[PDB]
Amino acid sequence: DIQVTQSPSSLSASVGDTVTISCRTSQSISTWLAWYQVKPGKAPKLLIYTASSLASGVPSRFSGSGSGTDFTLTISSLQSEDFATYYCQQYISLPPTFGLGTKVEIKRAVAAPSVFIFPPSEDQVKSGTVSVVCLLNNFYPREASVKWKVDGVLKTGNSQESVTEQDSKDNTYSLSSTLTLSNTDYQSHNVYACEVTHQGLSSPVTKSFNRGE
């Protein structure tokens, strides 16, 4: 397969900005590159083909350029409807292959997360399997790191993160980190803490509880 590599994976921008996203291929593809726009849960839409030809109906603020192994999509004066994920795709040869996308998201002021920790309810404890939930609410930008500590020791594994889409009203994100343990394991430690690092925090924030207190 011809490898198609898009950069950056995400860019933050504002309406009125000019934005540039890059697409590079592992071998030459002449000018056989297409660009697509995807909004959540919606069908993809062709924007550009043959590297620089605008598809029917696409507004002129979109322009494609490049040839060979290096290509560019430029959006001149970004508009509200342009926040989306963009994919490039080569078709000089079989199989056609796609880049993994660039998400163009809405810039706003930095906002630290408000952090909350939730111990497992007594009836989850009775089930024999417990979930400990750490919540990061209404923060920006997206990048955030959560570490779990048990009795002051780093706990890796057994955790899953989930994040919301950018809020339509305040453009923030929220995130859960859920630590899932057998009750036997859970009962073998006393204090449970989730430690959050984020640009809006000058130092990491920790929220903790003592099991059974």
């Binding site: 993809p44 796609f98 909350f116 939730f118 989930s162 899932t180």
Partner: protein
């Protein structure tokens, strides 16, 4: 101009055949090349194959060749499926051009896509959710509470608060597939700390495919 709409069973068990179809209108089916593209959760777009309308001539992705069948509406059959075949499946028209000056052709780019039909490959059986309270507050002015909705299958569940009268500050996370093969998510809401102790917060959890409805009071521990 052209309109594409794919359909098929939303669930397939492992080792079985995944079958999807695509209804196309608005143009002469014969003169165009039609095909399938998918995207598995967390993965990129992957071309499966494209076929000539008139003659049923076409090619497949070499990685999927061995278990793929595309026929002319057009149909897709993918045999011996596994969890990795869980994806959204899009119908599409594939365009190509002479690379000549020569007999060489380009491969395909895609000028029209359907909305895409989601298909999940899993051995799990339909199962209703458990619902556990997320409880902490009077030190801070704002408190968070929620409901953990887990061990259900298939998607989706819906969550509301106080029968839908509470909407501001609600966040309902996307579901995650656990190793067990069952899904889990949380719904959370932030409220004034001063309201805890006079107001009741109830999460209403619905899971249609099991016909399950749950109301769960979220109290201070």
């Amino acid at each position: 101009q052209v309109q594409l709409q794919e359909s098929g069973p939303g669930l397939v068990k492992p080792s079985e055949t995944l079958s999807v179809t695509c209804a196309v209108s608005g143009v002469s089916f014969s003169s165009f090349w039609w095909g399938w593209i998918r995207q598995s959760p967390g993965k990129g777009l992957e071309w499966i194959g494209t076929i000539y309308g008139s003659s049923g001539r076409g090619e497949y992705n070499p990685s999927l060749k061995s278990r793929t069948t595309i026929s002319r509406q057009i149909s897709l059959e993918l045999t011996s499926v596994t969890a990795a075949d869980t994806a959204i499946y899009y119908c599409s028209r594939g365009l190509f051009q002479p690379n000549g000056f020569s007999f060489t052709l380009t491969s395909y780019w895609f000028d029209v896509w359907g909305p895409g039909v989601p298909v999940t490959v899993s051995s799990a059986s339909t199962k209703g959710p458990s619902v556990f309270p997320l409880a902490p507050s009077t030190s801070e002015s704002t408190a968070a509470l929620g409901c953990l909705v887990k061990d259900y299958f298939p998607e989706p569940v819906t969550v509301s608060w106080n029968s839908g009268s509470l909407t501001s500050g609600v966040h309902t996370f996307p579901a995650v597939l656990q190793s067990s093969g069952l899904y889990s998510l949380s719904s959370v809401v932030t409220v004034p700390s001063s309201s805890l102790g006079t107001q009741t917060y109830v999460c209403n959890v619905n899971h249609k495919p099991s016909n399950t409805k749950v109301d769960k009071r979220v109290e201070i521990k």
